[PDB]
Design a protein around this ligand. Structure first.
Ligand SMILES: *[C@H](O)[C@H](CC(C)C)NC(=O)[C@H](CC(C)C)NC(=O)[C@H](CC(C)C)NC(=O)OCc1ccccc1
Ligand SMILES: *[C@H](O)[C@H](CC(C)C)NC(=O)[C@H](CC(C)C)NC(=O)[C@H](CC(C)C)NC(=O)OCc1ccccc1
Ligand SMILES: [Cl-]
Lengths: 306, 302
């Protein structure tokens, strides 16, 4: 037993991380087959990060202006193109370590693992959620751009995030691997602010089921609630509305534990209206909303990735 | 910026994980060079286990009683031996993915990453601290034994932990990679309990420095304290004593932030006695103690 904020094993992704240098700027890229994907702002200049004309800046570049390094091995760039906010650099060498992969655009409330990298070198891994305002609360320093977020299925790596910027408040914004930002953000240093960060109600209920599975039961009560009445309380604490689709995906956890979804909702309502009274749930004093129902089942059943 | 509980990349270790089966018991092994390491209780029988005599149980065992699977490939065991609480299975194939590595013994308060595995395959990775009572708060199910904890330094994988058991309250115990338990525990299903848990004071202070570096400073105050007076408060809240060596170890974080160590101790004292008054620190309502001072420097600066 036990329940931790658990990342995917990162080995498959580590083998795809490379370093891309353009002029003075160095960041990370993702090497899949004969293409390296990286944030296009690697071509920016010191005094042109406010209104960069990326089209004009790239066409004036040549293939040799992009220095791509896979560990100590140089990769010759033999083609370069722009796709939205990411750069597709074609290399003559196909990555022997390319995993079975796909590019996916995740929904708010969904979780993924971030492999933080610097100078093409993986530095650490941690679990993140796409917030309802399309930012993530990560850990990124200068040089971390190009680090990716991902999920794993069976043997297939689903890449969903590439890191581009940090907004004031220490929150992070990025794109999918098609180069399109999550949320309304743009890759220039003009004033931008994230929207309302609400709590992911379906994830909190999943984590409450994880608690029960692992022995924490003090918050269970003999009350029930209607979905209508729960949402009226939820809205007042800036929680996402719980929908029928959310009730459905909580089904399996409800069945494994014998606690009906609306009974767990009654417990969550009580916690919201009265707090924890100095007690803790899975070692937390706050209600955790960065585990999905599938994350809970994944960890509590011990599914592995070959 | 930002501050997260961060694990090491697990790829160097994934390449070392194998499956070991004896009878009907299956767990994980660590394949390094031509040797596979695993907990010795792989050789227990369901109806023994309360009080196994491992010497006696090895009387029967032959090499071929140990089935080792590296992914799909089957490894042939050509020799076995017991060292402390681990088995050393000699196989005829050296692991071509063996990293540069060493075995290290960590001390309470130090942190490490765990790659949780089942049937020799990875499930997930997370960061743990060796508690003062020589347990860790992990996430381990049946079949997870043999999963290892590690750090990565430069290009060297420093293995420090191998999982063996769970005590009630969901706390976890294991050995170093030489086979010697952390703490007073034995690999036997007789009643055992960890000492009462205490908080790793030097780590909380390091995390408070991380908070300042990342912009959270509402808890800084105008008071100071002495090392003695702070430890009077620590003791009453079940915090570990803070020593002059701890103060020294926190020096570099104190110099980076401009906040003397005993001034941060005064902040911590006020948090212990008054709470957070509805506020959070680095997104937490509780004082976090699973980041060492080195962990903070690493994450906040390369
Ligand atoms: C890439 O490695 C790096 C990672 C960050 C964690 C720093 N990102 C950038 O350098 C990025 C480059 C631009 C051209 C996309 N810029 C930012 O992320 C930037 C950082 C601040 C601290 C200057 N933030 C930013 O431009 O946000 C928009 C903004 C501007 C002005 C006021 C408020 C918000
Ligand atoms: C290995 O895969 C597995 C991982 C655990 C997370 C289940 N560990 C064991 O099977 C281990 C084997 C013994 C011989 C060392 N046993 C335990 O860890 C056992 C688990 C419980 C569920 C029985 N713990 C144990 O025996 O703790 C001591 C104890 C015994 C009786 C009463 C209180 C405490
Ligand atoms: Cl908390």
């Amino acid at each position: 037993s036990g329940f931790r904020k658990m990342a995917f094993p990162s080995g498959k992704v580590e083998g795809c991380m490379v370093q891309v240098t353009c002029g003075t700027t160095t960041l990370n890229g993702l090497w899949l087959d004969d293409v390296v994907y990286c944030p296009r702002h690697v071509i920016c200049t010191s005094e042109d990060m406010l209104n960069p004309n990326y089209e004009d800046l790239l066409i004036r570049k040549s293939n040799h202006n992009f220095l791509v390094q896979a560990g100590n091995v140089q990769l010759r760039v033999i083609g370069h193109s722009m796709q939205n906010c990411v750069l597709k650099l074609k290399v003559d060498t196909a990555n022997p370590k390319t995993p079975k992969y796909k590019f996916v655009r995740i929904q708010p409330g969904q979780t993924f693992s971030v492999l933080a990298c610097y100078n093409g070198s993986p530095s650490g891994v941690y679990q993140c959620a796409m917030r309802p305002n399309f930012t993530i609360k990560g850990s990124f320093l200068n040089g971390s751009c190009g680090s990716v977020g991902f999920n794993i299925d069976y043997d297939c790596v689903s890449f969903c995030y590439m890191h581009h910027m940090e907004l004031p408040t220490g929150v992070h914004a990025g794109t999918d691997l098609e180069g399109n930002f999550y949320g309304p953000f743009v890759d220039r240093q003009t004033a931008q602010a994230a929207g309302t960060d609400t709590t992911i109600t379906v994830n909190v209920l999943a984590w409450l089921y994880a608690a029960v599975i692992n022995g924490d039961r003090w918050f269970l009560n003999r009350f029930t609630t209607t979905l209508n009445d729960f949402n009226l309380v939820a809205m007042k604490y800036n929680y996402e509305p719980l929908t029928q689709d959310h009730v459905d995906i909580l089904g399996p956890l409800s069945a494994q534990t014998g606690i009906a979804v609306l009974d767990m909702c009654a417990s969550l309502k009580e916690l919201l209206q009265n707090g924890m009274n100095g007690r803790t749930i899975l070692g937390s004093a706050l209600l955790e909303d960065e585990f999905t129902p599938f994350d809970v089942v994944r960890q509590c059943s011990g599914v592995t990735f070959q």
